[PDB]
Amino acid sequence: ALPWYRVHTVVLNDPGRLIAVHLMHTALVAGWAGSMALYELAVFDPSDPVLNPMWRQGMFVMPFMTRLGITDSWGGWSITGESVSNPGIWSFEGVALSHIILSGMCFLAAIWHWVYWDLELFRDPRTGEPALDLPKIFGIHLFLSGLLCFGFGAFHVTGLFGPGIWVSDAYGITGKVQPVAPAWGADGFNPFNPGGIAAHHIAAGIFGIFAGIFHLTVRPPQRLYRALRMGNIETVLSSSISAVFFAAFVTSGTMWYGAAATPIELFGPTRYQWDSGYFQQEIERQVETSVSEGLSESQAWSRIPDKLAFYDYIGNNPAKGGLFRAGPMNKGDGIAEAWLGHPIFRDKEGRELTVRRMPAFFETFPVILVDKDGIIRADIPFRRAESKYSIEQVGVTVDFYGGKLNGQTFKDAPTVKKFARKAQLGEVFEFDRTSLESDGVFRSSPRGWYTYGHANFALLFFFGHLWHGGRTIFRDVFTGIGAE
């Protein structure tokens, strides 16, 4: 007589089948992560990890394997580009195939734990009715998570017995998996410090070890056992959900704003690296020091790596994509081939004109050429009749420096207008739009998609906190209320 939205409440008074169900959700989660990562290795192309990284190819779970120390594959390629003779067991294929084998064994264990539901372990030795001692189950399961927290931070992260965290420099050029020594001071709470991650899971693992030592021995008070309804199992679920969307705002927060746990070499740049000009000011800074050391201009721009100018591009901003457009970012405009260079616009007077750049809001933006003090000097006019700042009048010539257009100068209005339109989109690249049938509209990075799901999830789980929470407190009145 259960409705369709109460079919899974037959497991309330059955601890033996509460496990077989919780093992079946585990066999589907683990089977997903294995079969997702097998799908990503058929799609990944390690031809050029500089202009085609894993975050352009829409790899979602693959930056989570390389974050904790997996760089090699059985094909022989690596994300760091260094060749390997043998990655052993734990490569990309070894992890994907082992989350599958784990799924098949949690599947078979859930067939056991469903059939043999009647075990003496779950009975009450004082009444006979199936009961779970939820205060001491919390003591055991918190003491275990103290060990796996402290074990992770002390051994996997610090490189005592582990590879370590993917770290990087400040500007996403160099990055490698290395052990990270913990930073214990106030600098540990700098979230871009990778030492704070090692210091966290070591410190907070100890607090989780010795809280399980507390929550094993000491029984709850008489007041808190009645007030929080600790005999009911739904007060575990009411408050576990509260500890799960709270965790999901944090991870969606630190993915979106950036942290040391989200390197921009794996997930792509944030949008705050486009809004503040975080790479525009850096490419200029490596040219201001190059020109000061006695160079020509085109030799200064040639020192700039192609990777550094690739972050200075609006198509790598995650705040440019759309929702119902699908696929990788390479579906956007094609796989990048080379850097066309840095165009510098000069009028017939000779002063330097910078193209005003598109913000992340504007899908369309008028091409405007601005000199150093903010005065509008040239543009491309919508209304061509009464034109007072056209490129034909001002006579703007374009000069490239570096890239494959290294010393070139185009002077006529047909060609300068073509490079003035593509210079408001950050740097200027040559793409390959025929391999993936790239249509011509920008997609989003895996930084953008992770923030989408896990923040729309966490808003839905806020409703589950109120449903399952108000179902715990009000348990005596859910057939209805008495009229007396």
Binding site: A1, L2, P3, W4, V7, V10, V11, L12, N13, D14, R17, V115, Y116, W117, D118, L119, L323, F324, R325, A326
Partner: protein
């Protein structure tokens, strides 16, 4: 095996709630198709 579970229940869905759930799926299919085809 072990014994039969005393927590066996039955699932119900009357003819009323069928037409809600059918119309719920088709109207969500009408709404979200245009975006998926893009």
């Amino acid at each position: 095996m072990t014994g039969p579970n005393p927590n066996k229940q039955a699932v119900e869905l009357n003819r009323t709630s069928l037409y809600w759930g059918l119309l719920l799926i088709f109207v969500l299919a009408v709404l979200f198709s245009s975006y998926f085809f893009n």
